[PDB]
Amino acid sequence: PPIDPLPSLSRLMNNGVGKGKTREDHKQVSDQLYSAYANGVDIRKLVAIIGEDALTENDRRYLQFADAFERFFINQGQQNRSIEESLQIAWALLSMLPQGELKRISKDHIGKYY
Amino acid sequence: RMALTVAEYLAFEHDYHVLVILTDMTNYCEALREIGAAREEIPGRRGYPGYMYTDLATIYERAGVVEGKKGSVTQIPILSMPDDDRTHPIPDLTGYITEGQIQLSRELHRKGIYPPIDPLPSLSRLMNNGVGKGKTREDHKQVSDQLYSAYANGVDIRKLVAIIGEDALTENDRRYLQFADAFERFFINQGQQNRSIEESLQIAWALLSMLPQGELKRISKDHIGKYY
Amino acid sequence: MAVIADPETAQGFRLAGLEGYGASSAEEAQSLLETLVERGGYALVAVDEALLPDPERAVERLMRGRDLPVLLPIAGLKEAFQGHDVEGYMRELVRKTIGF
Amino acid sequence: PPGGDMSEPVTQSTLRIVGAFWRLDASLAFRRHFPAINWNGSYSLFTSALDPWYRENVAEDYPELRDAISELLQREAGLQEIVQLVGPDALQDAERLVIEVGRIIREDFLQQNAYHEVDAYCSMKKAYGIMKMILAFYKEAEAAIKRGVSIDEILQLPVLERIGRARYVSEEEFPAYFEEAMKEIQGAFKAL
Amino acid sequence: PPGGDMSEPVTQSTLRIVGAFWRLDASLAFRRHFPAINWNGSYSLFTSALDPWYRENVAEDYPELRDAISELLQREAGLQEIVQLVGPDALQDAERLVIEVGRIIREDFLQQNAYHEVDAYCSMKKAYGIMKMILAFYKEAEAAIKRGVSIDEILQLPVLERIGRARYVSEEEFPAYFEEAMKEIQGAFKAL
Amino acid sequence: PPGGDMSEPVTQSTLRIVGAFWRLDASLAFRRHFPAINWNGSYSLFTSALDPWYRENVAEDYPELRDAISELLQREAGLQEIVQLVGPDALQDAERLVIEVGRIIREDFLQQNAYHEVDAYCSMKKAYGIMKMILAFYKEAEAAIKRGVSIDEILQLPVLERIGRARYVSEEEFPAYFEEAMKEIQGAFKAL
Amino acid sequence: SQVSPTRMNLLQRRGQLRLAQKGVDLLKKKRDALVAEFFGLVREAMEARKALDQAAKEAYAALLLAQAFDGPEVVAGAALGVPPLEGVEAEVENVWGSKVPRLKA
């Protein structure tokens, strides 16, 4: 789907399901991926002015991250997915970011999966 | 309407090539507006009438060379439309109606160039449509196509320079802007000076030599040498 | 090259391996400086901190841009001088970057 | 649009919810594009149902290459904006890559004339052909930069001009013409 | 305009007529330089209709001198642009030339004091007069700065002040001060 | 509003009738603190007329505090932007001291809960004391850089932590907690 | 003279705000990077400068009244003068903040 998560935001996500009904990690892993993506759609218009070779290590990872996000996460066409398989994708993409760049989840969540 | 019936009479039925020239088609539109709202009928063309169409149809569509007649009614509308809006009723319908158009602006009227024709925003729809071919010379055929994208390269980058830098222009784009100031000055200042079909093309090609081969792809091998 | 310095310290830059054409002839060495960079037939031109031109605009307007540098700071004398650390740092902060 | 707005009921209900929606600008068409289209702001709704025939009849990479050309055309738009913001004060190898390519694409592939039968005509093979030439120029360019080939010289290959003389080529001549020209790209790239 | 633009119907109608126009702007008016007139905002068709009665009564060099002030401020429009994008101190000498010719065309010639009566009077003699003052300065400064002088030094020279006498000089004691100062322009600036 | 325009009836009508906008911003909300009131984008026209009665009924120096202390945040807003791009490290102690005091007001005083019972319900006799101490710390901190004191030392003081513990207590413990907290500040810049 | 139309212009001017605000956002952190590193080079610069300025001059100034007739001798044994036309090694480099050339002596 064309759905961009950035203009979007549900006003109710805590008044729907809770912990243990969508896995407990879902909550903070949602505000991880928000900030991780968003950062990268701004350095795509800096990918060849200044480049990504003249840019920090941290920001270089935050590029590639965005690209793989459209490919694997947003898009899947007509394939099905569960809460658990979507949180799976998430972890893998987030392993690439160090623990030092994981600060939008709990200590519990980092030690839950990388 | 009245005037055009005395056109019909003398071009068609007494075989003479009559030029009709209509001016102040904004003073027309003042009077059109009056009947627009003071009569029963309601506005429907963003605060002007909706029977406006017919009022600008009956006027313009009479004109045309008829096949069996030697003579013709060649109409030249001269607008005077409020400001430089293009949503204004007048240029609205007029655009659509006519095939091939000419514009004047204020780019070349601050330079002292009379006439101040500008074809960069202007458009043309007959220039390889029974014209540029036929008993109309083919020696300006490829010239028209060339002049377009060439004149463009010009005008546009005059704007792009004041953003990118303040004097920034690359090896290539330097040439673009070089052909702007020149073409416009010489060519578009006519006024009391008449140029024949031949006199045009000569001069035109010599400003075109400012761009090396590769932007001059549209002109053919013949054309280049033709008017060397 | 040319190094533009004090007469006595200009002396030691005219030695082989280096090429100098120094000496003071003014308080900002304008007399020499201008004439010399005008050609730009030296690989490097350098102006010391025992002179250094208070109007840098003067030079730029005459040489008319240069792809080689000009006015590199050299101390220009020895007296145990090393105030050219903090001085150059502030030289930078006053005309560009953040304030104080 | 009577008032000059492309946002009105009657455009939405049945003139933009159809198979294809297109647009025109005024200095766009004047350069040499007759008729002209907006590269971005124009879409087709139907395109997922036109994929069967194009796969089987033309080639099994005709639907792949046609999305692949459209990608490049609309990705240049990425940089377009910044050009009009404060400009490039830094030209890199990855900069002018998308930019020049895309240029050639708008110069020869969207400047067509409808008054000339050499600038357009109904023929599979012309569409197929032209789009394969551009694919070639593109392909090699990405591996030009890596080696140490300045984009400046990329302009100054005569083969860009060979693709710039495919929009005048005689219809009948095109097959043999195309085959001789595919070889020149790959030779004037890998050599230099 | 009740609305503050000329797009209003009541103001578009007053622009269906022809002949002469004038444009008064809010921004010039603040500086207490009335009349406020824009060279980019008006036209007249009584320029060439009045040219007979100019070179018959006024002077022969009046159809000539009027053109010779216009060019000045023509180039000022074009260059004003450039000025606000990057200062003219970065630009070359001859750019800044006509800019400060321009100063005096406002400081002492767009300020016609309705509270000083030697500016409340104006006539052809005060016209033609100050037109030759300005003329001098233009042709001298253009040659002066091709001898390596900068417009910086010339602002300090007495020549700048001198052209400024147009509101410190009378109407009906004017032919005493006209010719007087006129000479010093071509005299005492090519000595300096 | 969904966005609100000042040329929408709803906005330009209300704007006048009420005396206060107690604006919260989105940036401030993501930070998960209530009060989230964006001070630069808030105003209340009341304040003026409320100073008499405040010190009448409430306490002596209470108005004197509120108006005075607001300035911290003011003289921080324009300061942080891009001037302190990596913190201050190339900057003077003048400018350093603002963000040392800046730290305590925005991480202790601006923040408060609404889901902890120790600081969801506050009252005057609590808030007043909080607010006094943070004035008195600007008053001994700015005096520190005239004595020769670095911010390194300031960043290790138990006082900063005591400000955080004065809201991790309630209004009942406030008297005892006020004794200890207050006198601690005075003896924590007389150590420096 | 030149006044804006309403119906045609509307759609351009709404996307004008989209284009501008986002563009300028990232334009902001574009130069910020480059100035942070710049402090690093200006400081480090002078390190070698204090060390080697004084130990150059050490001998120079102590060879002026023992030179002016041993000037000849010293210039002879040593390697002859650096070329006045590009004796230094000039490097060209395109970078943001316009195309500025560098060099090493």
XYZ file of N, CA and C in Angstrom, chain E residues 2-191:
570
model
N -10.108 50.293 -3.089
C -10.670 50.123 -1.712
C -10.006 48.932 -1.188
N -9.603 47.945 -2.015
C -9.119 46.682 -1.482
C -7.619 46.645 -1.277
N -6.900 47.492 -2.004
C -5.433 47.549 -1.926
C -4.781 46.786 -2.998
N -5.378 46.549 -4.178
C -4.822 45.950 -5.377
C -5.617 46.515 -6.447
N -5.123 46.427 -7.706
C -5.777 46.974 -8.908
C -6.562 45.951 -9.560
N -6.757 44.872 -8.887
C -7.593 43.808 -9.457
C -9.120 44.086 -9.314
N -9.438 45.114 -8.463
C -10.797 45.612 -8.152
C -11.586 46.114 -9.315
N -12.854 45.932 -9.555
C -13.462 46.319 -10.814
C -13.418 47.833 -11.130
N -13.564 48.687 -10.047
C -13.522 50.081 -10.045
C -12.153 50.663 -10.443
N -11.081 49.772 -10.483
C -9.767 50.282 -10.775
C -9.285 49.710 -12.057
N -9.796 48.581 -12.495
C -9.527 48.037 -13.738
C -10.174 48.839 -14.855
N -11.366 49.472 -14.573
C -12.159 50.307 -15.466
C -11.322 51.564 -15.725
N -10.735 52.174 -14.698
C -9.900 53.408 -14.805
C -8.567 53.158 -15.518
N -8.376 51.863 -15.837
C -7.265 51.486 -16.640
C -7.740 50.881 -17.945
N -8.889 51.362 -18.469
C -9.298 50.939 -19.818
C -8.979 52.097 -20.735
N -8.998 53.267 -20.182
C -8.505 54.487 -20.868
C -6.963 54.506 -21.165
N -6.470 55.385 -22.053
C -4.996 55.514 -22.349
C -4.522 56.915 -22.276
N -3.161 57.112 -22.575
C -2.618 58.423 -22.540
C -1.530 58.179 -21.554
N -1.572 58.988 -20.432
C -0.522 58.965 -19.492
C -1.040 58.244 -18.264
N -0.114 57.644 -17.446
C -0.324 56.933 -16.185
C 0.774 57.417 -15.245
N 0.620 57.135 -13.970
C 1.513 57.422 -12.850
C 1.132 56.420 -11.802
N 2.107 56.043 -10.897
C 1.947 55.026 -9.927
C 2.614 55.562 -8.668
N 1.915 55.618 -7.580
C 2.355 56.127 -6.315
C 2.384 54.904 -5.485
N 3.487 54.693 -4.754
C 3.611 53.506 -4.001
C 3.682 53.859 -2.554
N 3.176 52.983 -1.677
C 3.188 53.103 -0.255
C 4.635 53.254 0.243
N 5.585 52.406 -0.255
C 6.965 52.324 0.252
C 7.874 53.528 0.077
N 7.833 54.267 -1.083
C 8.591 55.450 -1.317
C 8.123 56.613 -0.411
N 6.820 56.645 -0.251
C 6.028 57.678 0.412
C 6.361 57.896 1.865
N 6.882 56.788 2.514
C 7.208 56.816 3.949
C 8.374 57.847 4.237
N 9.457 57.752 3.399
C 10.659 58.497 3.380
C 10.433 60.026 3.224
N 9.133 60.460 3.053
C 8.766 61.882 2.919
C 9.388 62.496 1.772
N 9.393 61.734 0.640
C 9.833 62.073 -0.723
C 8.605 61.917 -1.481
N 7.856 63.024 -1.713
C 6.627 63.036 -2.482
C 7.123 63.918 -3.556
N 6.817 63.729 -4.857
C 5.925 62.770 -5.419
C 6.624 61.423 -5.386
N 5.909 60.267 -5.310
C 6.526 58.934 -5.261
C 6.069 58.464 -6.605
N 7.050 58.143 -7.542
C 6.884 57.696 -8.913
C 7.857 56.547 -9.227
N 7.397 55.575 -10.015
C 8.016 54.314 -10.304
C 8.162 54.366 -11.788
N 9.428 54.094 -12.264
C 9.845 54.057 -13.715
C 9.518 52.732 -14.362
N 9.173 51.754 -13.448
C 8.789 50.399 -13.771
C 7.247 50.261 -13.709
N 6.555 51.387 -13.513
C 5.145 51.296 -13.283
C 4.259 52.217 -14.040
N 4.892 53.052 -14.899
C 4.155 53.925 -15.740
C 4.661 53.969 -17.175
N 3.786 54.477 -18.087
C 4.028 54.732 -19.425
C 3.318 55.968 -19.848
N 3.737 56.628 -20.954
C 3.015 57.764 -21.382
C 3.026 57.656 -22.891
N 2.010 58.296 -23.542
C 1.933 58.383 -24.995
C 1.950 59.778 -25.429
N 2.310 60.706 -24.531
C 2.504 62.164 -24.715
C 3.909 62.492 -24.662
N 4.779 61.590 -25.045
C 6.186 61.760 -25.061
C 6.574 62.214 -26.445
N 5.957 61.602 -27.449
C 6.195 61.785 -28.868
C 5.098 62.595 -29.467
N 4.270 63.206 -28.633
C 3.176 63.999 -29.108
C 3.438 65.384 -28.748
N 4.395 65.549 -27.849
C 4.822 66.733 -27.200
C 6.208 67.108 -27.712
N 6.941 66.169 -28.358
C 8.285 66.301 -28.989
C 8.275 67.425 -29.995
N 7.319 67.771 -30.873
C 7.322 68.981 -31.630
C 7.455 70.237 -30.853
N 6.629 70.431 -29.784
C 6.517 71.652 -29.007
C 7.634 71.718 -27.996
N 8.331 70.615 -27.700
C 9.607 70.600 -26.993
C 10.747 71.259 -27.753
N 11.193 70.681 -28.899
C 12.245 71.254 -29.727
C 11.923 72.486 -30.513
N 10.748 73.128 -30.230
C 10.343 74.436 -30.713
C 10.368 75.543 -29.639
N 9.977 75.319 -28.352
C 9.834 76.343 -27.382
C 10.837 76.068 -26.408
N 10.784 74.851 -25.772
C 11.641 74.501 -24.628
C 13.167 74.560 -24.905
N 13.679 73.646 -25.720
C 15.040 73.686 -26.222
C 15.104 72.526 -27.212
N 16.110 72.565 -28.132
C 16.359 71.428 -29.068
C 16.834 70.167 -28.369
N 17.722 70.407 -27.360
C 18.322 69.315 -26.556
C 17.503 68.883 -25.381
N 16.156 69.038 -25.474
C 15.174 68.657 -24.424
C 14.570 67.258 -24.917
N 14.229 67.042 -26.152
C 13.872 65.671 -26.659
C 15.051 64.705 -26.531
N 16.214 65.240 -26.200
C 17.444 64.512 -26.128
C 17.747 64.282 -24.677
N 17.818 65.361 -23.830
C 18.150 65.269 -22.419
C 17.270 64.386 -21.562
N 15.989 64.339 -21.959
C 14.991 63.462 -21.212
C 15.307 61.961 -21.251
N 15.654 61.438 -22.444
C 16.237 60.111 -22.784
C 17.470 59.930 -21.987
N 18.335 60.944 -21.877
C 19.579 60.855 -21.117
C 19.477 60.748 -19.615
N 18.286 60.758 -19.030
C 18.091 60.515 -17.551
C 17.491 59.141 -17.325
N 16.689 58.729 -18.288
C 15.947 57.465 -18.315
C 16.738 56.218 -18.308
N 17.829 56.237 -19.087
C 18.793 55.160 -19.236
C 19.399 54.831 -17.920
N 19.767 55.887 -17.133
C 20.279 55.792 -15.790
C 19.462 54.919 -14.841
N 18.162 55.278 -14.815
C 17.339 54.704 -13.856
C 16.795 53.352 -14.478
N 16.934 53.121 -15.854
C 16.644 51.797 -16.587
C 17.458 50.668 -16.069
N 18.799 50.895 -16.062
C 19.781 50.094 -15.535
C 19.645 49.976 -14.035
N 18.945 50.927 -13.293
C 18.895 50.875 -11.860
C 17.952 49.822 -11.447
N 16.855 49.519 -12.224
C 15.840 48.521 -11.935
C 16.459 47.093 -11.884
N 17.041 46.759 -13.074
C 17.871 45.601 -13.373
C 18.972 45.174 -12.416
N 19.540 46.179 -11.774
C 20.667 46.074 -10.880
C 20.182 46.109 -9.448
N 19.114 46.884 -9.148
C 18.463 46.813 -7.817
C 18.260 45.347 -7.363
N 17.745 44.497 -8.233
C 17.527 43.090 -8.021
C 18.670 42.364 -7.392
N 19.864 42.663 -8.040
C 21.126 41.955 -7.897
C 21.713 42.325 -6.602
N 21.519 43.632 -6.235
C 21.919 44.346 -5.044
C 21.427 43.632 -3.763
N 20.098 43.189 -3.794
C 19.389 42.627 -2.634
C 19.697 41.152 -2.478
N 20.226 40.561 -3.541
C 20.617 39.181 -3.501
C 22.072 38.939 -2.970
N 22.968 39.908 -3.244
C 24.343 39.906 -2.865
C 24.667 41.396 -2.896
N 25.301 41.988 -1.825
C 25.667 43.389 -1.904
C 26.459 43.857 -3.149
N 26.552 45.130 -3.504
C 27.268 45.557 -4.715
C 28.692 45.894 -4.367
N 29.122 45.591 -3.139
C 30.480 45.865 -2.655
C 31.301 44.709 -3.085
N 30.611 43.573 -3.274
C 31.236 42.408 -3.824
C 31.418 42.622 -5.311
N 30.403 43.180 -6.029
C 30.521 43.602 -7.391
C 31.556 44.701 -7.638
N 31.934 44.773 -8.974
C 32.922 45.659 -9.569
C 32.420 47.047 -9.534
N 33.322 47.989 -9.853
C 33.207 49.422 -9.769
C 32.153 50.031 -10.513
N 32.216 49.767 -11.757
C 31.253 50.262 -12.779
C 29.800 49.786 -12.452
N 29.541 48.721 -11.673
C 28.210 48.252 -11.249
C 27.719 49.352 -10.252
N 28.505 49.708 -9.260
C 28.178 50.629 -8.210
C 28.104 52.033 -8.709
N 28.635 52.302 -9.929
C 28.596 53.630 -10.536
C 27.329 54.330 -10.524
N 26.414 53.806 -11.330
C 25.078 54.278 -11.646
C 24.089 54.161 -10.509
N 24.506 53.360 -9.470
C 23.728 53.142 -8.284
C 23.686 54.467 -7.479
N 24.853 55.139 -7.433
C 24.994 56.315 -6.655
C 24.895 57.574 -7.375
N 24.608 57.447 -8.716
C 24.089 58.509 -9.561
C 22.626 58.710 -9.088
N 22.027 57.500 -9.100
C 20.712 57.180 -8.589
C 20.250 57.744 -7.246
N 21.144 57.797 -6.276
C 20.961 58.416 -4.944
C 20.454 59.817 -5.052
N 21.029 60.634 -5.912
C 20.808 62.041 -6.014
C 19.432 62.150 -6.791
N 19.096 61.189 -7.718
C 17.811 61.186 -8.388
C 16.571 60.964 -7.392
N 16.889 60.896 -6.054
C 15.812 60.611 -5.061
C 15.994 61.587 -3.963
N 17.212 61.631 -3.337
C 17.609 62.521 -2.280
C 17.271 64.000 -2.529
N 17.529 64.413 -3.782
C 17.312 65.828 -4.132
C 16.554 65.972 -5.432
N 15.602 65.108 -5.818
C 14.951 65.247 -7.085
C 13.686 64.324 -7.132
N 13.399 63.545 -6.035
C 12.127 62.955 -5.811
C 11.490 63.457 -4.590
N 12.209 64.370 -3.961
C 11.763 65.175 -2.815
C 11.602 66.502 -3.391
N 10.332 66.902 -3.531
C 9.905 68.209 -3.980
C 9.037 68.545 -2.759
N 9.653 69.440 -1.909
C 9.064 69.785 -0.601
C 7.914 70.675 -0.904
N 6.757 70.307 -0.286
C 5.511 71.043 -0.381
C 5.548 72.041 0.830
N 6.633 71.984 1.679
C 6.901 72.918 2.766
C 8.079 73.829 2.506
N 8.793 73.629 1.358
C 9.844 74.576 0.920
C 9.372 75.036 -0.409
N 9.526 76.312 -0.683
C 8.799 76.922 -1.786
C 9.706 77.069 -2.984
N 11.004 76.605 -2.928
C 11.927 76.731 -4.004
C 11.912 75.399 -4.553
N 11.040 74.407 -4.060
C 10.843 73.115 -4.648
C 9.400 73.089 -4.976
N 8.538 73.959 -4.381
C 7.161 74.027 -4.693
C 7.006 74.677 -6.077
N 8.029 75.482 -6.495
C 8.093 76.066 -7.836
C 8.948 75.163 -8.618
N 8.577 74.915 -9.871
C 9.397 74.188 -10.787
C 8.877 74.601 -12.109
N 9.769 74.634 -13.074
C 9.432 75.025 -14.418
C 10.543 74.498 -15.294
N 10.439 74.763 -16.640
C 11.305 74.235 -17.628
C 12.719 74.620 -17.385
N 13.003 75.823 -16.885
C 14.342 76.283 -16.614
C 15.034 75.490 -15.452
N 14.274 75.184 -14.394
C 14.698 74.345 -13.339
C 14.734 72.835 -13.716
N 13.995 72.511 -14.777
C 13.897 71.209 -15.428
C 15.213 70.908 -16.043
N 15.286 71.387 -17.325
C 16.454 71.385 -18.208
C 17.727 71.608 -17.519
N 17.792 72.612 -16.625
C 18.934 72.942 -15.769
C 19.625 71.792 -15.147
N 18.964 71.141 -14.096
C 19.443 70.127 -13.125
C 19.663 68.797 -13.940
N 19.029 68.735 -15.163
C 19.213 67.667 -16.107
C 20.576 67.644 -16.743
N 21.280 68.771 -16.761
C 22.573 68.917 -17.363
C 23.571 68.787 -16.282
N 23.222 69.118 -14.991
C 24.043 68.838 -13.845
C 24.483 67.460 -13.696
N 23.491 66.507 -13.931
C 23.398 65.019 -13.680
C 24.130 64.434 -14.790
N 23.851 64.979 -16.078
C 24.473 64.594 -17.300
C 25.993 64.606 -17.214
N 26.530 65.707 -16.785
C 27.942 65.920 -16.551
C 28.607 64.825 -15.734
N 28.048 64.603 -14.560
C 28.470 63.682 -13.539
C 28.605 62.234 -13.966
N 27.541 61.686 -14.637
C 27.467 60.478 -15.390
C 28.693 60.348 -16.354
N 28.822 61.171 -17.399
C 29.889 61.030 -18.393
C 31.320 61.115 -17.864
N 31.568 61.865 -16.776
C 32.842 62.038 -16.066
C 33.170 60.890 -15.204
N 32.179 60.437 -14.384
C 32.437 59.314 -13.495
C 32.744 58.054 -14.136
N 32.147 57.749 -15.334
C 32.396 56.567 -16.205
C 33.832 56.412 -16.742
N 34.645 57.486 -16.776
C 35.897 57.573 -17.357
C 36.888 57.637 -16.205
N 36.454 58.338 -15.151
C 37.159 58.514 -13.908
C 37.565 57.219 -13.238
N 36.618 56.292 -13.135
C 36.752 54.995 -12.558
C 37.423 54.051 -13.595
N 37.646 54.348 -14.904
C 38.406 53.527 -15.842
C 39.879 53.931 -15.801
N 40.216 54.838 -14.817
C 41.519 55.265 -14.522
C 41.886 54.759 -13.192
N 41.090 53.791 -12.674
C 41.355 53.034 -11.461
C 40.789 53.612 -10.171
N 39.986 54.708 -10.206
C 39.434 55.382 -9.040
C 38.208 54.499 -8.600
N 37.807 54.553 -7.341
C 36.696 53.814 -6.759
C 35.659 54.843 -6.308
N 34.326 54.445 -6.431
C 33.207 55.333 -6.164
C 33.181 55.785 -4.688
N 33.899 54.965 -3.839
C 34.154 55.178 -2.364
C 34.776 56.568 -2.081
N 35.888 56.841 -2.779
C 36.640 58.047 -2.598
C 35.812 59.193 -3.088
N 34.986 59.008 -4.192
C 34.311 60.072 -4.863
C 33.162 60.608 -4.045
N 32.614 59.808 -3.083
C 31.516 60.156 -2.159
C 31.986 61.210 -1.167
N 33.339 61.098 -0.876
C 34.037 62.050 -0.008
C 34.446 63.265 -0.769
N 34.607 63.197 -2.137
C 34.984 64.318 -2.922
C 33.820 65.365 -2.954
N 34.104 66.656 -3.108
C 33.115 67.647 -3.057
C 32.056 67.564 -4.192
N 32.258 66.732 -5.229
C 31.515 66.644 -6.372
C 30.162 66.055 -6.093
N 29.998 65.227 -4.995
C 28.777 64.578 -4.725
C 27.751 65.571 -4.216
N 28.168 66.422 -3.262
C 27.425 67.551 -2.629
C 26.925 68.544 -3.592
N 27.788 68.838 -4.578
C 27.671 69.895 -5.527
C 26.462 69.718 -6.409
N 26.188 68.493 -6.931
C 25.007 68.161 -7.704
C 23.760 68.180 -6.908
N 23.885 68.212 -5.567
C 22.874 68.145 -4.597
C 22.199 69.522 -4.440
N 22.723 70.535 -5.176
C 22.151 71.906 -5.024
C 21.009 72.015 -6.012
N 19.716 71.903 -5.494
C 18.544 71.892 -6.336
C 17.420 72.372 -5.400
N 17.658 72.426 -4.074
C 16.695 72.713 -3.015
C 17.351 73.633 -2.002
N 18.484 74.228 -2.389
C 19.339 75.140 -1.604
C 19.577 76.291 -2.571
N 18.873 76.330 -3.710
C 19.066 77.294 -4.740
C 17.666 77.661 -5.108
N 17.512 78.872 -5.569
C 16.219 79.510 -5.877
C 15.722 79.062 -7.229
N 14.488 79.561 -7.466
C 13.742 79.493 -8.665
C 14.092 80.714 -9.505
N 13.946 81.984 -8.985
C 14.015 83.239 -9.659
C 15.302 83.985 -9.337
N 16.268 83.241 -8.778
C 17.729 83.658 -8.657
C 18.497 82.407 -9.167
N 17.767 81.400 -9.788
C 18.406 80.204 -10.322
C 19.399 80.474 -11.452
N 19.346 81.269 -12.490
C 20.331 81.332 -13.571
C 21.701 81.877 -13.108
N 21.859 82.319 -11.842
C 23.082 82.713 -11.202
C 23.870 81.533 -10.711
N 23.236 80.453 -10.301
C 23.910 79.325 -9.689
C 24.037 78.105 -10.626
N 23.192 78.072 -11.657
C 23.193 77.077 -12.748
C 24.573 76.865 -13.378
N 24.966 77.892 -14.120
C 26.127 77.830 -14.972
C 27.395 77.693 -14.104
N 27.312 78.459 -12.960
C 28.359 78.570 -11.993
C 29.076 77.257 -11.637
N 28.272 76.396 -10.887
C 28.628 75.098 -10.438
C 28.792 74.065 -11.503
N 28.057 74.234 -12.646
C 28.084 73.388 -13.771
C 29.535 73.032 -14.271
N 30.387 74.061 -14.292
C 31.683 74.023 -14.803
C 32.663 73.206 -14.000
N 32.622 73.388 -12.659
C 33.381 72.675 -11.691
C 33.218 71.182 -11.851
N 32.245 70.612 -12.622
C 31.926 69.174 -12.676
C 32.902 68.483 -13.598
N 33.120 69.148 -14.767
C 34.056 68.777 -15.836
C 35.437 69.249 -15.668
N 35.617 70.167 -14.673
C 36.813 70.831 -14.237
C 37.537 70.171 -13.113
N 36.934 70.364 -11.916
C 37.444 69.900 -10.678
C 36.960 68.461 -10.310
N 37.075 67.454 -11.152
C 36.940 66.045 -10.913
C 37.836 65.292 -11.861
N 38.330 65.884 -12.923
C 39.293 65.327 -13.851
C 40.585 65.875 -13.578
N 40.599 66.864 -12.553
C 41.884 67.321 -11.967
C 42.119 66.305 -10.878
